[PDB]
Amino acid sequence: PSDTLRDANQAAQELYVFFKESNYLREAKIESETSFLTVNNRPELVVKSTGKFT
Amino acid sequence: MQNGDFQILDYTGLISTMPRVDTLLQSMNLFTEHFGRTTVARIERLDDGAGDIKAVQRGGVRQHLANDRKKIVNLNIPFFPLDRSIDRADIQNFREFGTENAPATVDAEVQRHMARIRRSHAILKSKAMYAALKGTSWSPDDPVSDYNYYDVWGATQTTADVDFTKLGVDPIEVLEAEARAHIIDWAGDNGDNYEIVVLASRQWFSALIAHPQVTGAYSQYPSTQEILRRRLGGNANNRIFEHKNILFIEDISGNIPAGEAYIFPRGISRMFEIYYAPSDTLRDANQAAQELYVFFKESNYLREAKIESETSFLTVNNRPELVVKSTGKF
């Protein structure tokens, strides 16, 4: 989940994007957040290959 | 309404007063309004004329003409903000000051602030046109523009002074000779019978009427516009007079220095202009400007209320040549 109070311990999404306007017609801001981990569950079937050339 | 602890009294009414706000220049409609997008404007001039031909021998040399002239200028615009806020303490326990026991409401204070802001903006706009007519822009404490049109374009200030203490000399014989001659010789285009108008301070206008020449002019037979028995301009606050194909007006506002008067012609094209620029907001940025912007915000936490108003405009005089500083001596 994003760190926003909306979804604390609620669910997950691939990409959160927010757009803000100050309501005073003088400023705006853009937000984006992500949180993920890439895991290779089986580090047994990936084999390195190094090559001596010339 | 409550009197002392053990006595009462009757509330009667409310009395309110406010200073006058002048609108004579607004009424005359001498300024054209332009709504731009940026904060910079351009003006193009193109002046042309002709020369004189000199005699030459036959069959010999010839004569050649000169060329024309061009000029370009740029200008900026100032800014004018105005803000205020409202707090709980202003309405916590204060009686409305209207009915006997109605508690103070935020709406009433909001309306008071609206009225005050509108009055201030109107006064500023009024002062701007008076400053422009004098040949300089209005931008106090803002040296960014401070544009002196006489210097910017290149010109000089004609005086056409008049003395009223000479009972045996008609003052109009100086105004005509100097002002009208200069205006005719500097109209720039090929026109005719331009209408002349004069703005006069109270002292100047009052002294002009009392001059023996004018009184003797109308006294001996009725004619029309009976100065002696009627009032100039009827019962209106702003007196009006017309003598010798000229229009005279009294400046109640007092912006004109006492004893001074400005003479300028009507009808001339593009002599006066006013430009408006957008405000500092994302909604209006790069958009078309408006006369005045007003904003109001109620705090979502119920502990504040604020009011906001801003505007930005510039007044430009395109021909300083046709303004004459009449000065009286008494």
Partner: protein, 392 residues
């Protein structure tokens, strides 16, 4: 003039509505809170009865054609397509579509295929009205809008649903939602509102079980001089130890029967006796709140939101089912049928479009109907057509 001067503000109406909810019922969590509800025997029962009549209505469906000869041919082709989905039926679709009563939302994707051999060779059927479960959707942003919050461009599905143990364009998706206006893409689940009452209902039931177990009224208490108790603890092979061990087993087995009695020494050392046996009782007043009626109020509170509150004893329940039927029919009549006819270039006027009519949820009364036909028939206001005859 002919120009819009505003926006629907889909992207704002949502973002206010997620704050104004208790945090256990915001989008990424509501998927779990729904399935952790349902296991309440009053919540399951309300949903089950609702699906009972929805399935019944969409079982004997009918397609009503227009007047022209073109519409009648189109109606027959529509009936064939809707009754020949490969592995799908409208009853299964209806009971998948009606899941917005649990999550405020429902997503169905339309897939078309060509006919190889059959009555309408060369035309396009619908292969499957593929249901996309709400749980497999994107937990972050499920629904994606324009650069502004004006309209919807598509729906996102999580990448974790393509594994065993992406954005779908809006034109391919049939959206159904309830409980909110047109500006609320994520509809309000009927379980919102119930939630606070369900939290209380559960807690009270827990107190009743522990309260009934701990009401030790009439328990047996024995008083023995501490000289015997202390001697047994330090002399396991003394006569005091044997009698203490006998008491610990005899007192446990002390029931009421044909030979139950007590015999104790009557010695006295002070104002109080040495040996005694009394049955305890609450010295004062018992509980007052009567937790029974607390639960009944909360149960009726939950079932009322589903229209099934009559079990606590045209109706409210029948009218509630009609709401769900009409929402499904709008998507079916206005999103699938016009597109299905466009693919097979059947272009008709507005008055000639056939439409699908759901079945009747209440059975016909044989007594009422039979005597209604006579009263109309005896006057001659009933036309002689096979339509009337086939009704028997």
């Amino acid at each position: 003039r002919m120009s819009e001067q505003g926006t629907f503000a889909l992207a704002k109406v949502q973002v206010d509505s997620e704050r104004m909810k208790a945090e256990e019922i915001r989008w990424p969590h509501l998927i779990g809170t729904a399935e952790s509800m349902k296991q309440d025997a009053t919540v399951a029962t309300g949903l089950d009865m609702l699906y009972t009549f929805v399935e019944k209505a969409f079982k004997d469906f009918k397609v009503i054609p227009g007047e022209s000869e073109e519409s009648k041919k189109a109606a027959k082709f529509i009936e064939y397509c809707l009754k020949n989905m490969e592995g799908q039926t409208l009853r299964q679709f209806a009971r998948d579509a009606a899941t917005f009563n649990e999550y405020g939302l429902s997503v169905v994707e339309k897939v078309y295929t060509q006919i190889a051999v059959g009555e309408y060779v060369g035309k396009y059927k619908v292969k499957n009205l593929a249901f996309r479960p709400q749980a497999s959707l994107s937990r972050t942003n499920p629904i994606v809008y324009n650069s502004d919050g004006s309209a919807i461009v598509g729906i996102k599905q999580s990448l974790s649903a393509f594994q065993n143990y992406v954005i779908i364009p809006i034109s391919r998706v049939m959206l159904m939602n309830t409980g909110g206006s047109s500006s609320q893409a994520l509809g309000v689940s009927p379980l919102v509102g119930c939630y606070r009452a369900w939290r209380e209902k559960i807690l009270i039931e827990n107190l009743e079980v522990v309260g009934a177990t701990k009401d030790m009224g009439g328990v047996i208490e024995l008083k023995i001089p501490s000289q015997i108790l202390n001697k047994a603890a330090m002399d396991p092979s003394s006569p005091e130890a044997d009698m203490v061990r006998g008491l610990m087993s005899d007192a446990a087995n002390a029931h009421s029967g044909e030979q139950s009695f007590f015999m104790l020494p009557s010695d006295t050392k002070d104002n109080a006796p040495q040996y005694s046996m009394t049955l305890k009782g609450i010295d004062g007043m018992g509980k007052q709140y009567s937790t029974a009626q607390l639960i009944s109020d909360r149960k009726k509170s939950i079932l009322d939101r589903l229209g099934a509150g009559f079990i606590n004893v045209q109706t409210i329940h029948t009218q509630f089912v009609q709401r769900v039927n009409e929402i499904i029919l709008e998507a079916l009549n206005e999103n699938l049928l016009p597109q299905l006819l466009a693919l097979n270039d059947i272009r008709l006027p507005e008055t000639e479009m056939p439409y699908v009519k759901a079945g009747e949820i209440v059975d016909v009364d044989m007594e009422g109907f039979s005597k209604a036909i006579q009263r109309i028939g005896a006057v001659g206001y009933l036309p002689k057509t096979p339509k009337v005859i086939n009704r028997v």
